[PDB]
Amino acid sequence: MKLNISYPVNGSQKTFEIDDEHRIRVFFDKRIGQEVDGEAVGDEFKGYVFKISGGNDKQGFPMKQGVLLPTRIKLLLTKNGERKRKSVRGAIVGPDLAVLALVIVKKGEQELEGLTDTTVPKRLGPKRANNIRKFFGLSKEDDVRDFVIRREVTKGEKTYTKAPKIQRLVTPQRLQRKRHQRALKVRNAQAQREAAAEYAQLLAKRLSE
Amino acid sequence: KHLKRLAAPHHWLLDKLSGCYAPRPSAGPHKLRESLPLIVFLRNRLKYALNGREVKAILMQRHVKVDGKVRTDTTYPAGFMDVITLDATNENFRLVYDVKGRFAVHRITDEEASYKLGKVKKVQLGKKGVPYVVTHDGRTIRYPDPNIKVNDTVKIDLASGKITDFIKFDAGKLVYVTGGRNLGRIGTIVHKERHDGGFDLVHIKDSLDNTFVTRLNNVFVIGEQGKPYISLPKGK
Amino acid sequence: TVQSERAFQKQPHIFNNPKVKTSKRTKRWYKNAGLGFKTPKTAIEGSYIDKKCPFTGLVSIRGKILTGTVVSTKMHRTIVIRRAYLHYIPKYNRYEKRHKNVPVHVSPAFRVQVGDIVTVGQCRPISKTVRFNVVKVS
Amino acid sequence: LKTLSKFKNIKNVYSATELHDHLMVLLGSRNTDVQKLALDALLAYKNPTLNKYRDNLKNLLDDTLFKDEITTFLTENGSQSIKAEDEKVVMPYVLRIFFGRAQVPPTSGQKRSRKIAVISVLPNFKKPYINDFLSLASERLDYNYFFGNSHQINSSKATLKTIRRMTGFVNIVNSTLSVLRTNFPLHTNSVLQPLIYSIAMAYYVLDT
Amino acid sequence: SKGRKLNYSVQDPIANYEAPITSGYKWSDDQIDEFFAGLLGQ
Amino acid sequence: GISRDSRHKRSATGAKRAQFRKKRKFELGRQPANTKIGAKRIHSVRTRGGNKKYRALRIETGNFSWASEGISKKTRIAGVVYHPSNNELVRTNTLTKAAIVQIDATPFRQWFEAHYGQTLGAASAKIESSVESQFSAGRLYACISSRPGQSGRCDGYILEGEELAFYLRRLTAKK
Amino acid sequence: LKSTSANDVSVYQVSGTNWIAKKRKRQLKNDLEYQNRVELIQDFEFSEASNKIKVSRDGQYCMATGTKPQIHVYDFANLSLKFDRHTDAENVDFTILSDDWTKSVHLQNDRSIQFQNKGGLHYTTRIPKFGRSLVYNKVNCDLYVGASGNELYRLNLEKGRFLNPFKLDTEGVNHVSINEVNGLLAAGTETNVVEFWDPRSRSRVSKLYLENNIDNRPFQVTTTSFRNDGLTFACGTSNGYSYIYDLRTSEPSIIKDQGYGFDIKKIIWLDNVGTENKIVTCDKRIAKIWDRLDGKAYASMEPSVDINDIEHVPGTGMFFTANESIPMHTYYIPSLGPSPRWCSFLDSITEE
Amino acid sequence: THFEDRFDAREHKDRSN
RNA sequence: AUACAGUGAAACUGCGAACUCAUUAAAUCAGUUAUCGUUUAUUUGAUAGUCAUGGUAUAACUGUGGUAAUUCUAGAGCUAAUACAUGCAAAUCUCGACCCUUUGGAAGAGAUGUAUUUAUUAGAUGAUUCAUAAUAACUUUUCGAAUCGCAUGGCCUUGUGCUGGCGAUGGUUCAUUCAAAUUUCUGCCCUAUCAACUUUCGAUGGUAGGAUAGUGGCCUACCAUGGUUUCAACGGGUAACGGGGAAUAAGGGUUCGAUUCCGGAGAGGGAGCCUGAGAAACG
């Protein structure tokens, strides 16, 4: 059974293979979200703290958190909406799993190659101005325009730089739109006032006549 | 939603050899049976545009203004007492029915095109105690003259949507009939009566003293006796 | 007895105040039916409660106005009137009289016997087969 | 305030009475999050009588369950909400929570108009608790100095914020008077003196 | 009219919906009648 | 399901009308709202035109109006004591329009000692002997005037005067 | 998993209650405790409330009926909802004729009886008077319906015919039960008396008049329950009282008061489970399990929401209560008996 | 007893041919 | 382009997606009403005072894998909104004593969203318990622009303050238009070798309720008993691929063409359900 071990802070993840069922057998009879120390699995995994997160059957069927079975069952699942009957493997880890998904929570002393040692950055930076302020720790006085993340791509000799469009940003155009809406509602209130005024004086003229 | 060329109304006076499908009037101010689409008005009647693509080109180019404002829909319903302004030609048309019972244009001047007559189908008191009248084209006009009642005509300025003058329903007034077997007839009314197991019946006398009787909702007071507010086509 | 049924029979949205004694026994609401039909004095000072009454209920008279002779009055607050209209049969080459029976709701204000000419008017469907309500009794 | 709630032994911490009083002030503060954190701090204090009904106080602080909690807590015949012995301990907390709800600004929404229902729940309460609520309303307003200094206003004490506080107090008294009518308790130190002080301050600002 | 009175006819769909158990009850018939006779100390 | 069509109905002459049209959506009918006393559950039914109908399945409190004093207070609904249509509705406490139910008298009572200022149990302050006797037991008879299945609310008015006398004589006849 | 507190006995709530759901989803997104959760049966819920629940004798199907009025069948093999079938009216009481879910009889609120087959609804008939309780007798192929009137309606499903109803002295029958050993029929009338009938001779075997010393107010017999021996019989009366009778004698062996004052909706003898001589009596506040001989309180199950029905999986420790809330409550008592076959892994959760 | 009051295209159209 | 600014895959969002088989003569269809008895996506005309800008959760996208395998999948990592969630006392009026001073300024006294449910109180139309305006409440109760592109506006206060025009997409209620549902009367074969039919899915009404978009025996309680007719109710046959001036005609065929409505049901077969303004959906 392969072990798909992922460590979220680094973002770097790796799949290990263990032919010996004896080391695997500690994972047995435990459900998704239960927590295993790796010291039972192997000497190198001593100090590592693994949460069981997922798994797939030998037939490719996923493990569904919530059901207390080691066997496949037919459940009403959202299509992702009308629910559709689909087969899922249960949440309890059994012998008939081809891959078991494990998430590292605490790091052991002996480093693991390929996932603990290396790190991958996030693909996309924050677009919203408050998100940028939270990421860079900015005060209200500072501007996010010079502090936006700028990404450089080369196309031949020429170098091009692109930046995300700042959304929810205070602009003079936005201020003008808000002021224009306020002025429109005031103008309509005025117009209804002289509409009532001319109606009142017309009714008064007919009353006098 | 495809309307047949033979199923097109007689009011349009289309050529049957033109095409298989007639235009279907869009939703708007006038009902589908007594509407006249702008494509029919421009292409088959005014002959300005030869086919529907350049009809769409004209109504893109905003020369055609209907009732003051600009319409870009090809099948926009234009109906009775509608003023169509072609700004490139500076020619203004008023849509009136023919005596035979078909739509016809009338060349009108600018200060005549500035106003439009509408039949007050509803008088009611809206919210915040604001009186309103609902005319035959669907216009809602706030704060009318308190003398205005149902089935009276109001002269409406196109630029402001305001009632300048109004004509009261009364015997001995030149009315126009807008429905039924009597459609397209101009005449002053003899009287109004109630029909047992029926509706209000209006008895109208023509120029040749012939008497014809129609529904109350069919009539349209165009003016008092001897002074039509609008221009009228030749043939009376 | 106006209160014969198990539910309380009262005109909707009419409130007489128990605190203040009133000269009238009960506040009563009457509406002009229209079409030049006068509201009868039996409806004005009646104690009866009827939803379907054109003068003292929510039913309004609009549509056609008909006249007919009363045939049967067995059913409660309903009458069956007969209208005889002359018909032409081409194969017979002669006019032949035909009749149509119109079951009509009768208000308790009107008292009708068998053979009385009554004027009825159209209204919203009172029952499965009743669409007409009396408005004048001759 | 979250850290003060996460403290293990707030009672064993020093200045416990002053910290409790400041926690009640924070509960009387108008901000709902501040009220929630102050209620967490008082639950960390963990009086057994308050812990018996701690669910009801959290339900009252919650906006969605506010009316359902208030009706069941107020109606003693409807349900055995508060015991008579437990009423003495839990009454100041409910009074402070209702005061914090009533301190909310008027808004056309019914969720913020629920302050009217908060005022209308007061006929269910006994007269000393209504007097305590009026004392809380008159609190943060100074009138003893005015009634001591020969009924003369102080120019330094005169300020816009004093006028806002007096206006809020007068609005609370008006609502309480409307819901209580002839059963309203009128105490000369709790409600009567601040009203005369507010009228005198209004006269002084108008004369300015 | 609206089923307000019992109609003792044979309704076709419900007919032969299931079959009776021909073995009888758990107890013997004579014991059953004996228990019914002496039941509640009559 | 439930259809409100008339094609199954016999003609006036008595002819047996045979059906040739399937049941269609504009003739639809939904299941009745059996509405009991309980913690408030409301089921939101989408109707024709996108409008919403609120079914009340359990109602504990509702607004009840004292017409003579001109007030309306939110009171709990104790239980159904009488219903003109069915008696099994009274048996199973199904809230329904025109049902006579008992409400608690506490908010109206406190409003009375508040506003008139006299202990209940001058002439304008004096009220009816029957409602004064009802207040002693603490249960006021009231009639539900709001369709609970259609509206999601159980509103009513307190019975007063000859309507109250009629319903009390019907209650004494039933019991 | 957390156990509701009973003295020296652990009662676990596996599925149950403990706008609103919209805030609960936002809370559970952050909550790690609600991140991993145990759901025995998916969609083991009704939108507002659930009237009654029953478990098929085959053992792998559970049929329940709630409110739009619908019938839910849960397959224990797949641990999910098999199907949901809508009805024109709310269900008062229903029975399962077949071993599995295929054949069932539903007495609805609209004075009617509907026959649910596996393909769909099969037949709807209507009894003359509004019904309260339903029971089926196999060897006669007879269906007995207690109604508002004095007549107890009989419908022979073999011949397919309404038969002569049993005339009773007092109008109204709240519950009808049939002892499967003797064939006896017991009808609990609206008064204190219970009427005992023989279905073969179609005659009145006897009449039992209940008396309560503690309560002077009259009470209605609401529940009747027979045991597997045929000798004992339990009555549930609306004052909150359960009476245990030996059928030979005319006096109760024991009387148990729930103390809340509500009516008893269900009485269940726990004969199949290992600890025998226990009985469960259910009021809308609480369900109590106690020894029949001594009346010593063994366990208590108290949901926050009212109880409408309770069913016991035979030979196991679980109880399915149909309630007034959205989810039905499942209560596991390990000390009674083992967990069922289809959910054998719940013992590890209880240990955790 | 009832008047139709409808425009007739057959009556309006020329039929002399 | 030192925020983005051209064109734009994917994705999110929004709008649209309303042939076969069976034969009914007040049924259908054709007209004719009614909707003071109803629902509205759109169109058109009206309509709303009562923070220099909030918090997320994901797709596309990275990556690690499971399956013989599906538009199948699980674990870990990303960030957007006209997506989802959240959210802001002044001003206008009336009565204005008195002042001068007539237009006028003003001591002061007072007033003030919308929707839902119910109770109570006072402009249209032949006619209303209708419109509208109140009063006390009620709500798992709403709505009262945290949006977008073209212009760089006019002041002076050069504050980088004030606010500046054309347009998009929203949103409340009412009307209109588009439909639709019921409804009214008027009309179609042969036959007594077819005289009773209806309560045999309630038949005819009454009261109350449930239901529906709404009237209604549409359904349910309770209560009366009726309703249709030898003038043929009712029933049978009808080749009812029929008939309808429905339909343009027959621009000189003797009655003929051409067009339109057929009426219903199904989309392997029973049953239950869902989305929408509109379907008991060809999904």
Author numbering:
A (entry chain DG): 1 to 80, 90 to 218
B (entry chain DE): 7 to 242
C (entry chain DL): 6 to 143
D (entry chain UT): 832 to 1039
E (entry chain JK): 459 to 500
F (entry chain DI): 2 to 122, 147 to 200
G (entry chain JC): 3 to 20, 28 to 76, 78 to 362
H (entry chain JE): 222 to 238
Reproduce the article's own wording on this structure:
Nucleolar 90S pre-ribosomes are well-described stable intermediates, composed of pre-18S rRNA, ribosomal S-proteins, U3 snoRNA, and ~70 assembly factors. We identify snR30 (human U17), the only essential H/ACA snoRNA in yeast, which binds with Cbf5-Gar1-Nop10-Nhp2 to a pre-18S rRNA subdomain containing platform helices and ES6 of the 40S central domain. The snoRNP complex coordinates the recruitment of early assembly factors Krr1-Utp23-Kri1 and ribosomal proteins uS11-uS15, enabling isolated subdomain assembly. Our study reveals the essential role of snR30 in chaperoning central domain formation as a discrete assembly unit externalized from the pre-ribosomal core.
In contrast, the structural analysis of the Utp23-Krr1∆C3 isolate, that yielded more progressed but stalled 90S, revealed two distinct, but tethered particle populations: one was identified as the snR30 snoRNP complex, while the other exhibited a series of stalled 90S states. The mutant Krr1∆C3 allowed for the structural characterization of a later arrested state, in which the snoRNP interaction has remained intact and the failure of snR30 release resulted in stalling of the 90S maturation process. We observed several 90S intermediates, which all had in common an almost complete lack of the central domain including the platform domain. The most matured state largely resembled the previously observed 90S state B2, yet also displayed a complementary gap, where usually the ES6 and platform module would be integrated. Apparently, further 90S maturation is prevented by a failure of assembling the platform module into the 90S core, which is sterically hindered by the presence of the snR30 snoRNP and Kri1-Krr1-Utp23. Curiously, we observed another Krr1 molecule at its authentic position in the stalled 90S core. Moreover, Kri1 and Utp23 block a variety of essential platform-90S interactions, including the binding site of uS15 to the C-terminus of Rrp7 by Kri1. Failure of Rrp7 recruitment to the 90S leads to a lack of UTP-C and consequently Rrp5 and Rok1, the helicase implicated in snR30 release. Thus, the absence of UTP-C and Rrp5-Rok1 in our stalled 90S due to the Krr1 PBM mutation can explain why the inability of snR30 to dissociate from the 90S causes an early 90S biogenesis defect at the 18S rRNA platform region. Notably, the other 18S domains are assembled into this compact 90S particle, supporting the idea that they mature and assemble independently of each other.
